[PDB]
RNA sequence: GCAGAGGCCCCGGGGGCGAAGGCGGCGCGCAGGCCCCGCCGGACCGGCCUCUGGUGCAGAUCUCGGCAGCAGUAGCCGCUACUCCGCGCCCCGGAGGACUGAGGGGGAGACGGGUUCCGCGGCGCCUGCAUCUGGCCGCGGGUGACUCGGGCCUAAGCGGCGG
RNA sequence: GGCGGGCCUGAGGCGGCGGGGGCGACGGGCGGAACUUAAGCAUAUCAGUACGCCCCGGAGGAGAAACCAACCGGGAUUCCCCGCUAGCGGCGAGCGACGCGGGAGGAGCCCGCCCCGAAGGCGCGCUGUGGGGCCGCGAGGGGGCCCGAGGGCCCCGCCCGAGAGGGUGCAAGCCCCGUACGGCGAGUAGCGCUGCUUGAGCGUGCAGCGCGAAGGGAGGCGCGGCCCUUCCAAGGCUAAAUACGCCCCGGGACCGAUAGCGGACCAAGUAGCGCGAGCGAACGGUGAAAAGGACGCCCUGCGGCCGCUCAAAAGACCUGAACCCGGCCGGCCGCCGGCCCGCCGGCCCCGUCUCGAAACACGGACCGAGGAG
RNA sequence: GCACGCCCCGCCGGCGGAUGCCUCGGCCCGGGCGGCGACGAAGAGCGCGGCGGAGCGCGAGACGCGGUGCGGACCCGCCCGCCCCGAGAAGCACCGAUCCUCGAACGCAGCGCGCCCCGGCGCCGCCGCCUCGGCGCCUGCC
């Protein structure tokens, strides 16, 4: 259970807290699971969402693999290029399916350098907690 | 004549704007605002009206000083008032 | 209110580590015809008998001992009655000087509650 | 009215330039689905400093 | 895209000077365009906007420095540089004045001194 | 019977293989009420035991919200008034016939309203019939002073004064 | 009479520093009601309340006995528990303390007077200065079937110092966030007369005016003696335990949009109203994702029609009741009973006061929600 | 008789917003703080966004600016502007400034008018200081 008194673990509080957030805590929030193979390589389980990913969404009906196009914290939701709505006219532009990130395991990530360092330093306090804190 | 035509008869501006409360109570002849008390110093605050407190007072505008300062009071206004009770 | 009261006191007691919190208070007949058997914990010892244990008012506040120049003993025996509680607390009492020694000071061990109840 | 204040006419002047519908490019990029400004006056109904 | 502070800090007050005159000729300029014309954007304007803010900041940040240090170890400073405490700090007694004590209470303070102790 | 609380619901109560709610139809109960079925609906809901209460409505010239019949009813009875033609709207243009009748339904100011003024586009509202009209709506504009007025000075008055 | 200095009172100017005003609470000072209760109404009660004014502070006030008591006695103040009754009152209605005892908390002092006499804070002062909290990491889930989409089901597992919660296309310990586990003493006392007040009663405290001490105060029935216990007023400070709003934080056997704050709605003290003081609303919900409507047909055109998107139109919005109304179909009809079902029989309109209501008594158009031991 | 009006054997459709369900809101009880102002508060007015009305927020340096420590890709429309082991989007904590008109409100008014040598120019105290006034107390003179 909860043993600190500063979290809250009302309905009302949380919900208001999520649904209005800042910036920095949607992104965490929109975290999503690192793959298998890339969490052998770098010892996270899951990494914040990015607009170069590439990901798998394992569960929402369209379930296939895309870079993130385009990233919405308002909504809540990323896109993936290539998981759209069926564009009812042919010669129509595409409108992007939002798809939520816990929904999605991250196949490759934008590397970037700032990513590099934001990595090397979980792989550190990671350690910390490993070595028993 | 006591209703229409006596209401008829009005064209003139009883009240004007307060220079410190900029509402429509300062009255023209008398040279005081009914609800700021424009000219005096002291504010008019009675408290037969809780509702007209409220719709004037602390926290009914910016509040930007003192907001600015209760944050600093939790932050380092606190040291610097510790250094000035010691030597400066 | 009940953990305030303990956290405050917890706070106390560590600013004066060794030292009881209360200080020792002396025994008094409780007033009335009524309880005029019993006895009840008072404001302070008086000068006569800190006098009979050999100690000046200031030099008792430092050992612990509450000094109430306002009260008079009243009977020869209520003096005695605090004479022996005085001699009493000054053979339960240490006092640790010798600027700093920290060893002594750990094992101290802070009487809690009121002394010698 | 033609002999007026510049105290009077800036505050005046104010409710003219306020007295605006919600810009449509406001009301796209917010999600209003409120477009009406509430706070608009008209000069035969409402008076103004009274 | 605007000149960051970095560099006017790193310039003379006279530069800094002839530098907001030419920026506050070039918001003329902007806004004669821009009434003028019936839109580019005006991307410019914005950026010339906090342009002149931060030209300006610098302009006194620098005089501050130099006015302080001027008045500085000196009974009686101006205003604006004295510390910015509350209104209430400013009028309370100092540590020193608020422990401040008789001469014959500090005698027997010094006579009876604090005793560290412990009892059974 | 209601709405919460503590328990139980023998592999851990009922639910997108359709919850609560609504609409009709049975069944049980002296009744308060319950149950099931069909349909809609679209995520929650109970039975028993113990506990709690802001716990059951035909009324109170009850409160608030909806809305019926009267009823296509009463009425749109001030200011003498319109007509023809143009493409023609009650707008506009020409031609007639009137009217306000210089204490004007004229031309202007003080006040009060505060942009209503103007030009262009439109009618979704409003114009109590209509409208292509408009004081309505959208857009863009419009108030220039050495001599006029404020300011100025005093009037009734009002403040101010060692106190 | 003119003229220079010192003092003592006063002016004008300059500096340095402070004061002013604000907060719907708590805290102090003052002014101060009435409705009410007394089944009337004056004293009383309400109530030392509302309200007016004036000052603070994080607390404020109070505070180291001119104390209580009557003893095999205590010992500053404040708050708590108890005492609940001693008393007071048209002795009516009502009102009403304290002292013991148990606790929280405890801390003591300083001036004048007097001794020195500038030793001082030295433009002053001998008309006396000075001394005596942030920053983190953070576990462990698959297959099958189906669903618009599992977080559903059916089998098997894994992590719990984490199965508090929130989100995610349905009900998730293992999908995401988090959580558990971390780190860094004199015009006075008194007394006379008045007035206010108090439980204080031949005075509980205060005040005016008059008169005014010296060893005085008190001990809850006045006065004059005699004691006995107890204390030292007319100067000052003082922490703690206690109170409490805005604001922030957390929790709830709380309310669920006619409720809960007036106000859950990007714009509420808002829109509006009153010359003004002041008053004061209404308004929650599309869907998982706006995917917010493909196309064609026509229409002078409007608009319609198909359909489309979507699980669904859910189409300006969740469910969509009652009242009320339009089509189409079916009957001739209020209720209760018998029956095949339109015939016979019985039925006044409720509630409410009232001796008595169908009453030409009163309230009631209708329906929904709210509504009172 | 039909129509009407009723009633409904049922079938659809309006009109309304009840009922459920929800819920960034209230209320309630604890904490915790106790932090405004002439260095100009509280409040008020006017302005400020590339497109800009209300509200929020700022103050002509305006829908923000400088510094520091984090943070690391966005920025609800259209933008244009970033994107890169640092290059620096959203966000965050602090700190330094700017801060129009009113307002205790301070040259005088309230939006108009002075003074003054350029700094400014309100009141009330306290303490020094400067210029003085007195047939107050005297002293020195003539």
């Known amino acids: ?133 | ?88 | ?117 | 009215t033609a002999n007026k204040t510049l105290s009077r006419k800036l505050r005046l002047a104010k409710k003219t330039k306020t007295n605006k519908n919600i810009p449509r490019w406001v009301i796209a990029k917010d999600h209003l689905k409120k477009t009406w400004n509430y706070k608009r006056h008209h000069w035969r109904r409402s008076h103004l400093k009274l | ?120």
């Open chain 1, 1 to 133: 259970m909860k043993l600190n008194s500063a979290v809250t673990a009302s309905r009302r509080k949380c919900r208001k807290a999520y649904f209005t957030a800042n910036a920095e805590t949607r992104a965490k929030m929109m975290s999503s699971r690192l793959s298998k193979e890339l969490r052998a390589e770098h010892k996270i389980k899951t990494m914040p969402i990015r607009r170069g990913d590439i990901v798998e969404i394992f569960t929402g009906g369209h379930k296939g693999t895309g870079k993130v196009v385009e990233v919405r914290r308002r909504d809540y939701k990323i896109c993936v290029e290539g998981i759209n709505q069926k564009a009812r006219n042919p010669e129509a532009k595409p409108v992007p399916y939002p798809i939520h990130p816990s929904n999605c395991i991250i196949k490759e990530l934008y590397m970037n350098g700032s990513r590099y360092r934001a990595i090397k330093r979980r792989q550190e306090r990671n350690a910390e907690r490993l070595a028993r804190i």
């Open chain 3, 1 to 117: 209110r009940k953990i305030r009261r303990r956290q405050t006191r917890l706070q106390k007691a560590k600013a004066i580590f060794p030292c009881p919190l209360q200080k020792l208070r002396p025994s008094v007949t409780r007033c009335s015809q009524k309880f005029n058997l019993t006895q009840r914990i008072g404001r302070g010892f008086t000068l006569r008998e800190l006098q009979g244990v050999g100690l000046s008012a200031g030099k008792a506040r430092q050992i612990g001992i509450a000094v109430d120049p306002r009260r008079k003993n009243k009977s020869e025996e209520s003096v005695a009655r605090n004479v022996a509680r005085l001699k009493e607390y000054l053979s339960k009492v240490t006092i640790f000087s010798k600027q700093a020694k920290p060893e002594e000071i750990q094992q101290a061990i802070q009487h809690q509650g009121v002394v010698m109840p």
């Open chain 2, 1 to 88: 004549s006591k209703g229409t035509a006596s209401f008829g008869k009005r064209h003139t501006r009883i009240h004007g704007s307060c220079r410190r409360c900029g509402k429509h109570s300062f009255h023209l002849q008398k040279h005081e605002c009914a609800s700021c008390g424009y000219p005096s110093a002291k504010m008019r605050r009675y408290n037969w009206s809780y509702k007209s407190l409220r719709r004037r007072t602390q926290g009914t505008g910016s509040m930007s000083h003192m907001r600015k300062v209760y944050r600093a009071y939790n932050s380092g206004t606190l040291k610097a008032n510790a250094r000035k009770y010691l030597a400066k």
């Open chain 5, 1 to 120: 895209p605007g000149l960051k502070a970095k560099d006017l800090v790193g310039l003379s007050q006279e530069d800094l000077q002839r530098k907001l005159a030419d920026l506050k000729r070039e918001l003329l300029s902007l806004r004669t365009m821009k009434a003028t014309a019936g839109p580019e954007r005006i991307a410019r304007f914005r950026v010339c906007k906090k342009d002149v803010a931060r030209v300006l900041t610098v302009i006194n940040q620098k005089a501050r420095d130099e006015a302080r240090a001027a008045f500085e170890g000196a009974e009686h400073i101006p205003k604006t540089f004295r510390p910015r405490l509350t209104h209430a700090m400013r009028c309370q007694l100092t540590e020193k004045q608020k422990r401040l004590l008789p001469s014959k209470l500090m005698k027997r303070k010094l006579q009876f001194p604090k005793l560290k102790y412990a009892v059974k």
